[PDB]
Amino acid sequence: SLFKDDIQLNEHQVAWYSKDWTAVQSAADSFKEKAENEFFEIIGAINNKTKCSIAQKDYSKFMVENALSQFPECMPAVYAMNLIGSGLSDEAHFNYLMAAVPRGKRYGKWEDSTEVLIIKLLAKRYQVNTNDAINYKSILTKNGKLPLVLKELKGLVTDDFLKEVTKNVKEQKQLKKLALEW
Amino acid sequence: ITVNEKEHILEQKYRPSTIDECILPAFDKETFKSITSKGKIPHIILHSPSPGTGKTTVAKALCHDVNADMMFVNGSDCKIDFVRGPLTNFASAASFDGRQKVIVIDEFCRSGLAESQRHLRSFMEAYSSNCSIIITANNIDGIIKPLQSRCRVITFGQPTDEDKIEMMKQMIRRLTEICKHEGIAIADMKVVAALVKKNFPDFRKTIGELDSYSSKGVLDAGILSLVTNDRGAIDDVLESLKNKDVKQLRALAPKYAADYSWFVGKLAEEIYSRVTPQSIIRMYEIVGENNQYHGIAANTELHLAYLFIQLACEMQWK
Amino acid sequence: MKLSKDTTALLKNFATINSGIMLKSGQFIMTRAVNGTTYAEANISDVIDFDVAIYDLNGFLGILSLVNDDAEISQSEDGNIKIADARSTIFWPAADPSTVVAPNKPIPFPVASAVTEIKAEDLQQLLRVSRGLQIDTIAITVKEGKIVINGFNKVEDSALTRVKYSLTLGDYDGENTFNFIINMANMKMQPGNYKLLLWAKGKQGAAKFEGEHANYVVALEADSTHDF
Amino acid sequence: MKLSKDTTALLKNFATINSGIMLKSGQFIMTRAVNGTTYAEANISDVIDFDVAIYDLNGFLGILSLVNDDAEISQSEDGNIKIADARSTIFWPAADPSTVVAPNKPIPFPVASAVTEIKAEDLQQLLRVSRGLQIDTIAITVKEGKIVINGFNKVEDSALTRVKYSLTLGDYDGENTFNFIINMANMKMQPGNYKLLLWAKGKQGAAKFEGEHANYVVALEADSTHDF
DNA sequence: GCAGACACTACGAGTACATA
DNA sequence: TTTTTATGTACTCGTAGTGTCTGC
Ligand SMILES: Nc1ncnc2c1ncn2[C@@H]1O[C@H](COP(=O)(O)OP(=O)(O)O)[C@@H](O)[C@H]1O
Ligand SMILES: [Mg+2]
């Protein structure tokens, strides 16, 4: 047993002093801090006139433009970078948007799950597009039992299909959501 | 009249199997029959920017009338690794009963498929002896010109007056067969011819409106009441425009970036009747210049968002 | 229905041709390739009771790989497939027969235009040489009376010019000249002896492999030539 | 022109030194690592009748392990390498000799600065202890008048200070003091008794292993210190 | 007469990159 | 005061399953 009144080394020492590496793996995970990442704060520097100095930060014209796509006052420069900003340097992209966005004071933010599984499930079945799939459901909600076609498609709801739309934790409350359809 | 009795949606269930059964204008019906008469099919890009004209049915009809070993795939699911794997293993091998091999790519003008499109040039040439490709396009410019080099660009022509008179009653007797085959009570057609004329070219939206009346037993009602113009008018084209809802205007852009050319074109047509002449001349400048630059347009989505913000804040809606 | 070791191994083979399989009542199982290039059939010793379609045949055999050999595969009173173990019990969801592309049409092979037989260790050596020599296409022709299988590198060799391997399989009798090219990829038979049946007339043809238990019918590449 | 299994065993060893090999006609073969790290020369029991360069010697022998040992090798009219078997034939492509880094002439090893004589089982134990003590570099030097080998763990040792082994080999009758370092990764010789010849002049150096049929020139390390 | 253990491959993950 | 969208490509790392070789 435990030698009672001896000093117990920390769990790192316990795992490390044992060639049991699965516990050492648990020891390293204790410092993961992946929830404590960074992400942007360059947009805030764009509309605040702050020394961003991106270089190593993850720059995405896809994203950085689409964030200013919500604010219509920043849209003239976003419309330009959409036009001619293709093939323009990342460092140049932030530098153009520096003197291009008006004032700063970074602001707020920027179609549901149980519908979007049916829409994407009808789309793959009949090999149609989103637009066509969306209309299919809307007409099927009105007519010859959409509940019937839900059962026709209970077999091809794989976890690869599911997790592809909303990973998080829903694709398990959605996996066995459309289970009860018989 | 061909019915896939195992089908649950009337659009897919009453799909014509033969090119004859297709309700198509003259010159086209003459063209496709000429193509099927040859017994061998060349690369075809048949395209029509108007929805529900019969792009997908004709593509499948040509595969049937020629007795093809068809592999039908949607363009969106037709990525490049899909072309390397299955599509190649298909067109490389020869079918056991001979017969033409065809690969139909439905709605291949989708934007993300540009690089897999670039794979097909040389793919189509390497296997042109054993297999041809039919491409269904909504926006023809979405097809890289080297593919149009390899394909026959069939554009669905504007149906003449005789074509409109004949196709409607051809669709009428088609609606007679399906309703009598489905069990729907006709209760005298009367409005049935008016429904076909209501959405004349769009036969798919006409059949789709027969659906929603399957729970009902009647064929007659004021169908121009429930989601009539559920295409270019009842999808925030009115309400969300005017009020200058920037938040909604931006969220309404994506749902349409798919087919930019149609949308804009229908946007310049119906708008001429909602706003003042001072904004009539004004809307053409901004819409003309947004359409003028849809190529430099890296992201078509944000290009629509710029059209909406400049359109909503300058139109004197009456 | 009970699934033995020889039958699950066959299903592990048929899974390679189609991600799932449709099987109706009897002892005859059959699957075809999605594109329609490889058709496999098999009469087996284990008898199945009902008709069922499995979409995830690979995952179905993996879940079955935890239950003892007494595995009772039954239909659920609602419709699914329950797997009864000596202790535990699993529930697997069955799929619609139209989700799994089924062969459906087991039309018999015609008359054999040419006949030979390939040994088990001869197929073995062909598949093991190709693994080391990167052979992607093989052509079956005649050389000096005896018929042979030649392997190439279609990518490294456009029109199959330079041979990289050749296996003789006995002599041809009739005075015909041909060269049936088969893709090595769409050639998914399991190890064993196969009486090779070759049928081709005009511009259509196929290759049938008659194993002691199952049959594999593959398609021939369009480049193939024959004077039949 | 068949290759005996001891000759091929020596060939699969040479493939560790260089991924290819350039072998001319005769009984003599040789190769040198691309990074000028090791050089092996050997006369063998079989006779090569034609010059050929093999771009992938590893895959060549791995394929040659698939035909029977009586396989007759030759230069086909298909100008490559013909592997005639009882029934099969393998056409292994001959490679352009310009793509195979090979010693254009056998390295005439200079007069040895020091001569010792490793035993085969002494070499065997040296490899076993290295795989157990993570010994990556060894040094051959003088210890109390005898030539010994001492291995380290350059990863943990860095400066090469903590001795981890000492194979006391022969005795040294000279007066020089040397510390020749060899990297274990360059010990590509097959097990067998070797007469070890050492040479070093200034900032140069190499070690030679004279065998009962195969010789090996392995390079010394940058930190080799000597007074020759 | 096979196990062990190194040796090899495949794959999930994560990463960085270029496009529309 | 916010936190994500598609396709295709190339590379590294970690681990885990599979392959070839060896014992006092
Ligand atoms: N020319 C036509 N003749 C007969 N039916 C048609 C025709 N065009 C469309 N349809 C009907 O519309 C449905 C879908 O047509 P589809 O080929 O998808 O057109 P599109 O691809 O242009 O939307 C079919 O089920 C068919 O019944
Ligand atoms: Mg369509």
**What residue type is assigned to position D102 of the chain?**
A
Q: Is the CB of B141 under 7 A from strand E?
A: no
- Best of C156, C163, C169, C171 to mutate (most D CBs within 10 Å, chain D): C163
Beta bridge partners of B88: none
Measured in angstroms, the CA of B144 and the nearest CA of chain A are apart by: 19
DSSP label at residue A131: H
Q: Which amino acid is at B219?
A: L
Q: If DSSP codes are grouped into helix, strand and coil, which group holds residue A53? A: coil
Strand partners for C93 = none
Give dist(CA C189, CA C207) in Å, integer.
12
**Backbone phi and psi for residue D44, each to the nearest 5 degrees, phi listed first:** -135, 180
CA of A148 to the centre of ligand 1 (A): 24
Pair of tokens at residue D152? 């380290």
Contact C162 D90 (CB under 8 A): no
Could you tell me the distance, in angstroms and rounded to a whole number, from the CA of residue B23 to the centre of ligand 1? 9
Angle (deg, nearest 10), helices A75-83 and A61-68: 150
Three-state SS at A46: helix
At B92, list the tokens: 């490389």
Q: What angle do CA B2, B3, B8 make, to 5 degrees?
A: 155
- Is B211 in contact with A84 (Cβ distance < 8 A)? no
The set of residues, in sequence order, having a beta carbon less than 8 Å from that of D53 and lying 6+ positions away, is D20, D21, D22, D23, D94, D95, D96, D97, D99, D100, D102
The DSSP annotation for A91-118 comes to HHHHHHHHHHS-----------HHHHHH
Verify whether the Cβ–Cβ distance A155 to C78 is below 8 Å: no
The answer to whether the beta carbon of residue A109 comes closer than 7 angstroms to any atom of strand F is yes
Domain holding D206, by residue range, is 1-228
C1’ F23 / CA D124, Å: 14
- Measured in Å, residue B58 CA sits from the centre of ligand 2 at 10
Q: In this structure, what token pair is assigned to residue D2?
A: 């068949």
Chain A neighbours (≥3 Cβ pairs under 8 A) are: B, C
Sign of CA dihedral B230, B231, B235, B237: negative
Which residue has a Cα nearest atom 23 of ligand 1? B52
Number of domains in chain D: 1
Q: Which chain A residues are closer than 8 Å to B9 by Cβ? A: 126, 136, 140, 149
| Closest nucleotide to B78, Cα to C1' | F7
* Best mutation target, A124, A154, A157, to test chain C (most C CBs within 10 A): A154
Host H or E run for residue C61: helix C57-64
Please name the residue whose Cα sits nearest to atom 9 of ligand 1: B54
Q: Does C56 touch chain A (CB under 8 A)?
A: yes
Please calculate the CA angle D12-D17-D23 and round it to the nearest 5 degrees: 65
Which two structure tokens, joined as six digits, stand for C218? 């593959």
Between CA C100 and CA C94 the distance in angstroms is 11
Q: Which residue of B has its CA nearest to C158?
A: B126
Residue nearest (by alpha carbon) to ligand 1 atom 11 = B204
Question: Which atom, in ligand 1's list, is nearest to the CA of B11?
Answer: 25
* CA–CA distance, C109 with A19 (Å, rounded to integer): 62
Which single residue is written with the structure tokens 């790519």?
B105
Q: Are D165 and D133 in contact (CB under 8 A)?
A: yes
PDB experimental method: X-ray
Report which of C41, C72, C70, C15 is spatially closest to residue C210, judged by C-alpha positions.
C41
Sign of CA dihedral A109, A115, A119, A121: positive
Q: CA D187, C1' F23: Å apart? A: 24
Q: Considering only CA atoms, which of B46, B44, B37, B48 is closest in space to residue B131?
A: B44
Contact D168, D138 (CB under 8 A): no
The sheet with strand D179-183 has its strands ordered as: D167-171, D146-152, D137-143, D179-183
Mark yes or no for CB contact C164/D91 under 8 Å: yes
Q: What span, in angstroms and rounded, lies between the C-alpha atoms of C184 and B89? A: 10
Q: Is B14 annotated as a binding residue?
A: yes
Residues in chain C closer than 8 A to D89 (CB atoms): 165-167
Q: What is the spatial distance between Cα C127 and Cα B182, in angstroms, rounded to a whole number?
A: 55
B46 contacts B55 by C-beta, under 8 angstroms: yes
DSSP state of C69: T
- Chains C and A make contact, 3+ CB pairs within 8 Å: yes
**Can you name the residues that pair with D46 across neighbouring β-strands?**
none
Burial class (CB in 10 A: 0-12, 13-18, 19+), B230: middle
One-letter-per-residue 3-state SS of chain B: CCCCCCCCCHHHHCCCCCCCCCCCCCCHHHHHHHHHHCCCCCCEEEECCCCCCCHHHHHHHHHHHCCCEEEEEECCCCCHHHHHHHHHHHHHECCCCCCCEEEEEECCCCHHHHHHHHHHHHHHHHCCCCEEEEEEECCHHHCCHHHHHHCEEEECCCCCHHHHHHHHHHHHHHHHHHHHHHCCECCCCCHHHHHHHHCCCCHHHHHHHHCCCCCCCECCCCCCCCCCCCCCCCCCCCHHHHCCCHHHHHHCCHHHCCCHHHHHHHHHHHHHHCECHHHHHHHHHHHHHHHHCCCCCCCHHHHHHHHHHHHHCCCCEC
Distance from the Cα of C176 to chain D's closest Cα (Å) equals 22
CB contact under 8 A, D90 and C133: yes
Contact C114, C129 (CB under 8 A): no
CB B178 within 8 A of CB B10: yes
Q: Give the ligand at the shortest distance from the Cα of B62.
A: 1
What is the secondary structure of chain D as a DSSP string?
Answer: ----HHHHHHHHHHHHH-SSEEE-SEEEEEEE-TTS-EEEEEEEEEEE-S-EEES-HHHHHHHHTTS-TT-EEEE-SSSSEEEE-SSEEEEEPP--GGGS---SS-------SEEEEE-HHHHHHHHHHHHHHT--EEEEEEETTEEEEEEE-HHHHSSS-S----EEEEE--S----EEEEEGGG--PPSS-EEEEEE--TT--EEEEE-SSEEEEEEBPTT-B---
Residue C112 (CA) to nucleotide E2 (C1'), in angstroms, measures 47
Taking the C-alpha atoms of B44, B48, B51 and B55 in order, what is their torsion angle to the nearest 10 degrees?
Answer: -20
Strand E: list positions under 7 Å from protein Cβ: 6, 19-20
Do D and A touch, 3+ Cβ pairs within 8 Å? The answer is no
Distance, in Å, from the CA atom of B120 to the CA atom of B133, rounded to the nearest integer, reads 10
| Interface with D, mutate which of C133, C161, C163 (most D CBs under 10 A) | C133
CATH number of domain containing D74? 3.70.10.10
The CA-atom distances, in angstroms, between C129 and each of B95, B104, D40, D69, D92 are 28, 37, 29, 15, 11
Cβ contacts of C76 within 8 Å, gap of 6 or more: C82, C91
CA distances from D179 to B185, B297, D205 (A): 104, 70, 11
B173 marked among binding-site residues: no
Q: What's the token pair of residue D63?
A: 């394929």
Q: Give counts: helices (H), strands (E), chain A.
A: 11, 0
